[PDB]
């Protein structure tokens, strides 16, 4: 049930898209990359499996900037991703309450705004995915 190698290779060729869309920085992700990422989820079930692995990996390893981007991407996929992608997202959704607990020391310039944005995005994702 794991992705066939042909799907792993197709997905590798898509990584320029995803690298820009989830870059761990304060530059908002542009709209066209949301559209491209939803298109990736529809390529095949194996493409969707690879995409979930990738997005959850980025969510774990990124600072709040990249975490926020992943959570926004997942929220968009709730409305435009494939049915199979949303199924495996629901089956692997224990991460949402962890994203909703993201916290740390406040920034002298921005306070806790970034943490609050990440937690709010996780709450919105949970409300959408779980209702």
**Using CB under 8 A as the criterion, which residues of the chain lie in contact with its own copies when the complex forms?**
2, 5-6, 8-9, 11-12, 15, 18-19, 23-24, 50, 53-54, 57-58, 90, 93-94, 96-98, 100-101, 103, 119, 122-123, 126-127, 129-131
B/e letters for 108-130, b = 16+ CB within 10 Å, e = fewer, are eeeeeebbebbbebbebbbeebe
Minimum Å distance from CB 121 to its own copies? 12
Least Å from the CB of residue 110 to its own copies:
19
Which is closer to its own copies, CB of 38 or CB of 89? 89
Six-digit token pair at 86? 């949303």
Q: How far apart are CA 12 and CA 104, in angstroms?
A: 33
């Amino acid at each position: 049930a794991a992705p066939p190698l042909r799907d792993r290779l197709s997905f590798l060729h898509r990584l320029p898209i995803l690298l820009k869309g989830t870059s761990d920085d304060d530059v908002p992700c542009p709209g066209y990359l949301f559209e491209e990422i939803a298109k990736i989820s529809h390529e095949s079930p194996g493409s969707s499996q690879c995409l979930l692995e990738y997005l959850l990996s980025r969510l774990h390893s990124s600072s709040g900037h990249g975490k926020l981007k992943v959570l926004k991407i997942l929220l968009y996929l709730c409305s435009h991703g494939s049915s199979f992608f949303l199924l495996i997202l629901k089956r692997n959704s224990a991460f949402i309450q962890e994203a909703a607990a993201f916290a740390g020391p406040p920034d002298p310039l921005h306070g806790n705004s970034l943490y609050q944005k990440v937690r709010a995005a996780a709450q919105d994702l949970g409300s959408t995915l779980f209702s």
